[model samples]
Target chain A: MVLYFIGLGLYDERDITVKGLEIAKKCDYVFAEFYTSMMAGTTLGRIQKLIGKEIRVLSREDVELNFENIVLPLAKENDVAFLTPGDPLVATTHAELRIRAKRAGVESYVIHAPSIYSAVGITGLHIYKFGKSATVAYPEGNWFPTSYYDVIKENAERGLHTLLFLDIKAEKRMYMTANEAMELLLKVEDMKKGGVFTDDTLVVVLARAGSLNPTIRAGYVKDLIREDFGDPPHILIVPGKLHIVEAEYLVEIAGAPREILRVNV
Target chain B: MVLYFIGLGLYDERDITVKGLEIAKKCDYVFAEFYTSMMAGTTLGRIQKLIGKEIRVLSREDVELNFENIVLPLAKENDVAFLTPGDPLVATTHAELRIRAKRAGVESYVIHAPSIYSAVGITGLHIYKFGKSATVAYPEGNWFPTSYYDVIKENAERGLHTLLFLDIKAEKRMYMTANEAMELLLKVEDMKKGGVFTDDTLVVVLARAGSLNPTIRAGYVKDLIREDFGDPPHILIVPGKLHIVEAEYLVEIAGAPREILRVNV
Candidate 1:
């Protein structure tokens, strides 16, 4: 018996790779992890119908549990696939699972799918210019966190770009909008007491990744607090010192006012 | 007329998103950038053939030169797709072109592709753990440059992972191997004389990402220096201050000897 780790690309059910789709169709049992990322544009139910497999979805707790109790036994008994939203091998848990299977004398294979990182370039940021990528946490009560500030500060110090993914509860219809995310960063800067970021700090917002209508904007973080940035799965880019070309391009393409842009002004 | 910036995704010719492929096929002109990153198993010629279009290859110089004498006019006259090896937006140059197109009153669109940053999660190192990512430069003479040390050090100070993409010149078949990358880091560390990283720093190496025979390994700097990490386009991960879970998982999965892993030790 073998274990197949499959990555369904960042889109609808049809986004699974040809190899992944083929192996998944033949697997005796299939399971998926959704807490780490998302299932692109379709629901698991829709994917199950398209692929003709009964997928057992695993949450953060379920996969984090000992593999022996949750998944290894199934692999030992029959061909199984531990699938993730994007290319299966892109995450550590999947790699750890593969190592475990190897130690247990179970053959393992991997299938790849595209992840959100790929969208950085798609949304018009220099991937090389980005420093550490950060995620926005959901606001709890009157307390909005400030961890992302450290990341932004670090990037700012070095003239790097920051990619920020808004928190998304894939099943619950709960998502941190880009506009809200920008405001949160500003609030964190002000409330955290570090004053690392000010109102003029340039922030670029992207919404509706992987879909037909994607919006890219660059401006002051404060300005974005009131602007509409569209729907779910939004991302915010906090740029460090902009390259001369980047400054010009942002102003010309994203309608970023030249005065606010990091141009000759 | 419209200008569509398309991402070719990671890996071979087939890795391009369906929408990108369709746009490439239907566009009045197709252009591609290959200098920044290579398309692992596929060549630009192969991609051009597969997509059934005469893709005009653009050099780094071409992109830097103002678009007026280059492909900008084609975009204005008819719908054209500016293709890049990975995601187009990942490069600042592509964003510049988009801005240029917009300034010329040419409509612009984008088709995003996957990026290495998003896929590093496969190593079990959280994306949040990464502070900043920097490229390991090609060693020059007796002086191995220490330019990348600052970025790695700052990330380390914040307990963040440092993703080191070994510098590779794909067109000439030149790649900084994993072992070589470790050696370069050692050189950089020595030059800094700051003890930011030592002989015992835990590192992860990913070889031939997005390939069928992809390889992953984790260990200390000294340990990895002796180990053979095969193939080209390899990436190194220097884990920052380890949490109990990340440390335990690395030890269990990648045969990383625990004795030299954490800082307190």
Candidate 2:
């Protein structure tokens, strides 16, 4: 008689909270969708083993287009669980599912987890200073998306940091690297010429967060654009005018240039 | 030799990730500080039993003033874990601890967990739309902070949502409720009179997020100003222009007004 939305936090199967895992263990059915974000460290088999259940994997079409038809029916009669990567309903366009649960006369609850949104703090930037976030989308032939470039410009102009989420196509196993995201932003800068992203722009990259020794690096675009951050999941940050503490961490922890320590107050 | 900064996720002990719990179990020393946010759902004994370690609780002064004196010397030889509420580095100004560890010749890594910063998604608001966040502070004898009011104005002017974190004095067990935050904003509105927050303004309150049944309510300040949301540790949000889908979820799941279905897009 209930539908639960649980988030498997960044990285692997173990990232699921004991609260989420314990609740999932008691559910009559478990359904998960990974297309929202990839789970690079754990596999479907590992998740099933951890929960001691047969997990059903749903595609984006199934959840977005046919959630009520597929999941809610079972939720109407038995306790059902729907799992997603990172914080569910945040980065994904699935907050509407709660409405579906209500319309179906099913109770729905959300279990929280670590998301790249807050995990960006691992790079030592003040999380409260981040402004409106944007995603770097994969551009088609002529429809280049330069709006994200404007987002950086707007945030930088206000002396507020910007969090840029790299795009991912889980079905195609196509994850945009921070390097790729940086390259695209530079190209957008070439056209806009607004001085938003250039070779001298300082950027921070965090890959495979929540994993052992996840990559965290910060430097100017020209020096670190081709840097190897490792693995599929990568998060990029464009910090605004830095506080001395922020700059020091970027230098000592992330290997950013010592020159940035004197760049901004 | 190493220091692990692990986040005990929102609400309770079970909220800790398996990775965090597993790593904590193997640590030679475990220390925690909860002054940043309260852990309302669990006790020290419960957490100690769960991790099978003697958890040392640190005061705010102990951490901010003497972290190196107390924790680092142990960390220099034995593995130490510092448990904190929410994501380790996002809400708190503790990322510099890693820098401290570096200077002390100790290695450090962060283990992620759920945080209210990301857990705000349970309110049915799109996470990406949240702009710069602010805190509703408790006014001192003559010092009243109104910068949070300006934050709402700025984010609203740009069509972005504002996340308002209420104040909490953990040692005194004093928590500023959502109602208090609303009243503070109204008081600030009375003084500033910027029309950013008024009686007619739409708001959402999420309390005890990550629990099985969190309080999720949405409505105007006039209607919900005195409503009881149950317990302490509340979070308030003032939304900007709403998307139709966002308004619908607010209506269906959060018990918001039906009239908002026709609200601005």
Candidate 3:
């Protein structure tokens, strides 16, 4: 009896590793959660067909609060698989589930997959240059989160790029766009009066990252604030002083402003 | 008529995505390079058997110098796939190959897979807390690389973790182990005297990431310098101030010193 945490890589059902898919095929039960990140390319039906199993979808509460009571019980007696979009543990609190499984005397293992954290290399920016990542969340009522803006400031000061994850409310079927994230940052900037995120700040936008021809755009915030990137899943990047090669890639591959070659490089 | 850059994930042959496997099997030519990173869990024969294709292994020179002449010719008339361990572009210079393909009038696509970049989540460190990554290189003659150590210093100052990729000489079959990396850091500390890395510094070592039972150890450098951590292809993490949850995970899961729960947490 064992429990496996398998990642369905960015995009579709086929993104699952051969090892992940093969092991999932033999599992007595399969459970998945979509609250962490969205899989834009394919549907649950397609994933079920690929794995040849009846997949039980779990909500945030089910997995976060009642994982031991639900999944671990079945895992103790039979093989069980838990699936998540992208790598299972990245940016998610799923690692704590391993501890819960351990407490239940259930053996657990993780099967890795492509995550947006690494897939951002598709935009042609050197992945190693990325600094601490932060998520741009929707300001709810009087509760506004400006820590993400501070993260960008701190990273940019050190000539490091900042990867900002756009917020998503899977239950409400609402996803935060790059435009909205920028707008929030602008509002925070006005109040804090910090020269962190401004209209002239250079930024990169990547949408539908796992797709064959996903959107890759880089330019000043003023020019790109309202630019259409297309799709629900989008990520924003605030690049620091760029290297010559990084500037060349942004200009050649992402259609960034030619001036960035001199200004940011 | 096309070129595909597919990732073989991490660790083993089965780590290749189902999509990558299917596309690679259909390619008229399959070329792979191992210089970028090591896949310690599987052999070339095992990968060949899994894909049912004879993969022509390429050296770093072969791809960097002759990719346009060698791989581009076959891709013009037939489908070709170039495989690398982990996500194709992460930490590797293969993204430049896409530029060369474009100049040769060849179209290319990238198939994503798991990379240690994101798979570090297995160590229970928050992915968002990682700052700019660096490589710990073997000091040759009088040439010592301390830029990686500086990266940790900068990241630590900002309460961010630093991921250090250990050096590997694929041709010579030489891999820099975590212990060796620690020794190098200690040597650098003695010279730079930055007080950034010392025997008392807390560090984490992750080996064979993606394996079911990867070695994840965390402790003071003095305590873990010579501790066995299984095999090669290791990585080091110099964490900044840890969150309580992070400290608990390190203590319970990674076997960190219990004192860190109160001190670092």
lDDT of 3 by residue, A1-265 (tens): 6999999988889889998999999999999999999898999999999999999999999998999988999999999999999998895588889989888999999999889999999878899999999999899998997899889999999999999999999978788999999999999999998899999999999998777778889999999999999986899999999988788778877889899987888
Model 2 stretches astray by more than 4 angstroms: none
Query: How far out, in Å, is residue A67 in model 3?
Result: 0.8
Tens digits of lDDT, candidate 2, A27-49: 99999998888899999999999
Report clash pairs, candidate 3.
none
Predicted candidate 1 versus true structure: per-residue lDDT over A169-224, tens digit per residue = 75676778877776677777767766666787777876666665667788876677
The DockQ value obtained for model 3 is 0.80
For model 2, which pairs clash? none
Indicate the worst ten consecutive residues by lDDT in candidate 1 chain A.
A86-95
C-alpha RMSD for every candidate: 3.7, 1.1, 1.2
Worst 10 residues of 2 chain A by lDDT: A87-96
TM-score of each candidate?
Answer: 0.84, 0.98, 0.98
Name the candidate that leads on lDDT. 3
Error of 2 at A163 (Å): 0.9
Lowest summed-lDDT stretch of 10 residues in model 3 chain B? B256-265
**Candidate 1, B50-123: lDDT as tens digits:** 78989888877877785545777887778888887666666555666666676688877766655566656656
